[PDB]
Amino acid sequence: WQSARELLRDWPSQRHLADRVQPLRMRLSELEQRLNNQQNAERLLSEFCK
């Protein structure tokens, strides 16, 4: 009984957040591309400093 109650408690949250996988997917893809840009322009910046 108790485990089932908890399961049906968490199951809503799972449904609520599952849809965001793809919204999350493009989000992190863009974010990580931005971080790569950061790293890359940082190397260019350091080369200027040189």
Partner: peptide, 30 residues
């Protein structure tokens, strides 16, 4: 470095989708 956080969110969300597919009918019947 949000990638850590968003990646963790993805782990959670894809685990959730997998479980929902796994048992969705069972949960609905219960």
């Amino acid at each position: 470095d949000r990638v850590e956080e968003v990646r963790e969110e993805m782990d959670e969300a894809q685990e959730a989708a997998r479980f929902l597919q796994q048992h969705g009918s069972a949960l609905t019947k219960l």
